[PDB]
Write a protein that binds this ligand. Sequence first.
Ligand SMILES: [Ca+2]
Ligand SMILES: [Ca+2]
Ligand SMILES: [Ca+2]
Lengths: 271, 126
Amino acid sequence: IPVIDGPTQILVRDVSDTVAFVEWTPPRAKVDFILLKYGLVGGEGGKTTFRLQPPLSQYSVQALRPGSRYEVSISAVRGTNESDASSTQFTTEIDAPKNLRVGSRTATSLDLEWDNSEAEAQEYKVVYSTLAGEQYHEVLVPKGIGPTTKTTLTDLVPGTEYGVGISAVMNSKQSIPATMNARTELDSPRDLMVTASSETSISLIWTKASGPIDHYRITFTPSSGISSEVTVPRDRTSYTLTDLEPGAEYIISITAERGRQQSLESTVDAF
Amino acid sequence: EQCEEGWTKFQGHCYRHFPDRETWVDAERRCREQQSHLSSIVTPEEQEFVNKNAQDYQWIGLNDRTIEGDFRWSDGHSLQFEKWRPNQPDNFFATGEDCVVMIWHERGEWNDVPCNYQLPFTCKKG
Ligand SMILES: [Ca+2]
Ligand SMILES: [Ca+2]
Ligand SMILES: [Ca+2]
């Protein structure tokens, strides 16, 4: 039976992933210090106690485990007499995954990897879009086994910048997303080949590159250093070279350009 | 005053596109090492030139980092011309969506995005 009264009506008004703002109304009468106790609800626990000065009707508790359930209590001591404790429970928010990176880039895919959250998350919500800010795609990625989780985004548009947000998910609860950006490669034309191979001209075919480009660029080199260039619009899938040496044994490269980006090369020879 | 090595002149100011990808704060911090600021865009003609000179997604100096929703140029210029993408700005991601990118293939229209993204940028001084 507590001789003396103490602080009451404890409140946890705001909580991030590692921090809680605790609030209470002070004791009516004299008290020489206040006790704030907190710890995990999960038996394998133990409490932290701070002894605070009587003026304070609030305190910020720090370095808490994310996605975990805590008990917090507040009481007063005067001489050898502890008061009743006002107690409440609360749950820290789920922490966002850390260290997002891109591995393999191609024209239509990005490989993502991130560190798993300290909190238990069965799944990760991966939300993405071009930076043009059209409607986002969404994808639930089961948690990887190790310290890390990977996924690959597919069917992306070549040569474009994506924004990605990854959130840890347990129950209906979500962490805020962690963000990063990445650029897909520009797609390359493939299978550029000879159609005609005459003494003055070479009529080339080639497998069209994919997604938005501006134009193709064919460079043609016969002698050691001297190399010339031509341009060809998007629409086209074949060109004819016209000014050349007689049966000169070339080797010819084609490439797609959009803005400041160019794609990897393709090549065949002509005699 | 005339135009330095690596810069190019447009309607009174000098400009330089840097292809190296940096966060918005680092891009602005780079610009300031050269007595410059991430570019502000005050007329359509400046839009068209800064877009056309870069031809890439890039940071400009518009941001709402100090007061959410209130976009300001890093160089103190008043906001009198805007060229936003449909439905932007939207503060999509609650963490740090406060910095503005020029979407080059869409007439160079602007989207607010996470400041932690790494992107090329253009600097501008007189
Ligand atoms: Ca903000
Ligand atoms: Ca914002
Ligand atoms: Ca946006």
